[PDB]
Amino acid sequence: SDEINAQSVWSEEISSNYPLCIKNLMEGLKKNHHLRYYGRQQLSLFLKGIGLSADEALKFWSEAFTNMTMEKFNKEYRYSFRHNYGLEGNRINYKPWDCHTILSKPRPGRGDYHGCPFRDWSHERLSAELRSMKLTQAQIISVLDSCQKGEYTIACTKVFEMTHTHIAHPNLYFERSRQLQ
Ligand code: SF4
């Protein structure tokens, strides 16, 4: 669909369907005009999964890395992004990451936005985000209980149900949310 493009992915109509990890990656990208490696990978493969074309992805990434010149973007990042679309080397059209894959990556440190917020954020940070999403105190306690147990995809599924099958892939969360929209 032509509805998913370099500009629409920043709009509320599309972004309201993102799970917490993708919202966190978009926030880091908008604040810093950049993402570190694992965040570039997690977000670019998710956007490929929602239908962002290779041409639109290059527009998205070059526009989002707003503070560098197009020549620096082309020298330093274009190959990596094209490679994610199966346009380089062996031309493997890499699949988007599921939660299992996301969780397997090195844990995020200072300045990183990849990973899973249900594992990576403090209960203080999660509670504030869930309050902003209109969840009640009882609902927040239920989500945090799943987090404490290490059941991140269950916490994420609870947030999906509370804000709208077990979800264990950010692209499935997006697709299910978009179909209900
Ligand atoms: S459980 Fe999966 S889709 Fe949900 S925020 Fe974590 S990594 Fe993203």
Author numbering: 316 to 381, 385 to 482, 495 to 511
From the paper:
DNA synthesis during replication relies on RNA primers synthesised by the primase, a specialised DNA-dependent RNA polymerase that can initiate nucleic acid synthesis de novo. In archaeal and eukaryotic organisms, the primase is a heterodimeric enzyme resulting from the constitutive association of a small (PriS) and large (PriL) subunit. The ability of the primase to initiate synthesis of an RNA primer depends on a conserved Fe-S domain at the C-terminus of PriL (PriL-CTD). Recently, it has been reported that a conserved sequence in the C-terminal region of archaeal and eukaryotic PriL folds in a separate domain around an Fe-S cluster cofactor coordinated by four conserved cysteines (PriL-Carboxy-Terminal Domain; PriL-CTD).
The most conspicuous feature of the PriL-CTD architecture is its organisation in two largely independent domains, arranged as triangular wedges joined via their thin ends. The larger N-terminal domain spans residues 321 to 433 whereas the smaller C-terminal domain includes residues 434 to 512. When the structure of the yeast PriL-CTD was compared to protein structures in Protein Data Bank in Dali no significant structural similarity with known Fe-S proteins was detected, confirming that the PriL-CTD represents a novel type of Fe-S cluster-binding domain. Surprisingly, the search identified significant matches, with Z-scores ranging from 8.0 to 6.1, between the larger N-terminal domain of PriL-CTD and members of the DNA photolyase/cryptochrome family, DNA repair enzymes that revert the accidental cross-linking of adjacent bases, such as cyclobutane-pyrimidine dimers (CPD) and pyrimidine-pyrimidone (6-4) dimers, caused by ultraviolet light. The portion of the DNA photolyase/cryptochrome structure identified as similar to the N-terminal domain of PriL-CTD encompasses its active site and includes the FAD- and DNA-binding sites. The mode of binding of single-stranded (ss) DNA and FAD observed in the co-crystal structure of the DASH cryptochrome 3 from A. thaliana suggests that the PriL-CTD could adopt a similar mode of interaction with the template DNA and ribonucleotides during de novo RNA synthesis. In particular, the spacial relationship between FAD and the extruded, cross-linked pyrimidine dimer observed in the active site of DNA photolyase suggests a possible arrangement for the pairing of the first dinucleotide of the RNA primer onto template DNA during the initiation step catalysed by the primase. The structural similarity of the N-terminal domain of PriL-CTD with the active site of DNA photolyase and the analysis of its electrostatic potential and surface-residue conservation predicts that the PriL-CTD should possess a DNA binding ability. The rather low DNA-binding affinity of the PriL-CTD agrees with previous biochemical evidence that the DNA-binding ability of the eukaryotic primase is mainly provided by the small subunit PriS.
